Structure formats: C-alpha cells, structure tokens
Prior knowledge:
39% of the residues lie in helices and 20% in strands. The chain has 147 residues and is of the alpha+beta class. The protein has one domain (1-147). A 5-stranded antiparallel sheet has the order 1-2-3-4-5. Keywords: Acetylation, ATP-binding, Cell cycle, Cell division, Nucleotide-binding, Phosphoprotein, Transferase, Ubl conjugation, Ubl conjugation pathway.
Amino acid sequence: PHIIRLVYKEVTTLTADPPDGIKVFPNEEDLTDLQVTIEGPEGTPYAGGLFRMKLLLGKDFPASPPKGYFLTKIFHPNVGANGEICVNVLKRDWTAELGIRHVLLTIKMLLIHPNPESALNEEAGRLLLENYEEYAARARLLTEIHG
C-alpha cells in the first residue's frame, strides 16, 4: 500500500546511509522480507562475528513491531531455537514513529545488552545472571563456529 512507499523511503535510506555495523539487502521485488547482517560489536562475546537476520514486516505493521529472525545460529538470551529475536522494549514501547532503522539499532543493542527477564533461551538467560564468564565463553565459542 502507501506503507510500501514509506518503507521504500526508509529502506532506501538504510542502504544508502547504513548504521555502523549494519548492512541491509532488500530485494526490490520483496520489500517485506528484509535480509540484514549485523556485525558482532567489539567488546561483546559476538565480536568478529557476521550475523545474518531477516526482518519480517508483519501483517499488522506498522501498528505492531516487525518480527526479527536470526539466520545465524547464536547463543543469546533473547533468541529462540528457531532464531527468533524478542526485543521486549520494542513490544512494550512500540509506536509507528519508530523507524526500521530504530528496530535494527535496537536488535544490535540487545546483542550488547541482553535482557534475561524475557529470555527465549533459558540457559543463556540463567548463565548471563548466575555465571557470566560462562555465558560469554559459550557465546564467544558459538560466534567462532557460526559467525
């Protein structure tokens, strides 16, 4: 619809003026399955990694936040076994004025600062809290394997 234009504008800006560490590859025929890559931010267990995700603008978008999925296997509290990403702040604070650039920046932030309260990976959530050195070593080891 006319939303297609609004996203075409933002996505085109995203490819031209990309956020640091984030590259967006939309197919012009498919502007609702956005292939994205996030580099593991320096200082995180994911440093040096290349993380392929897909951003799925839902049917109720942009009144509900888009759903993000990691294609790269990752050990992260907010990522499920299918690769699903849970950004609770986005769920809780979502308004239409939040651009796609914001979602992608938020997902990048979550890699740096997971949220164990709403963890899809229980074990990662526990480890982040109970034994941090062990969560970081596993996230780092799995980054080396799949990053």
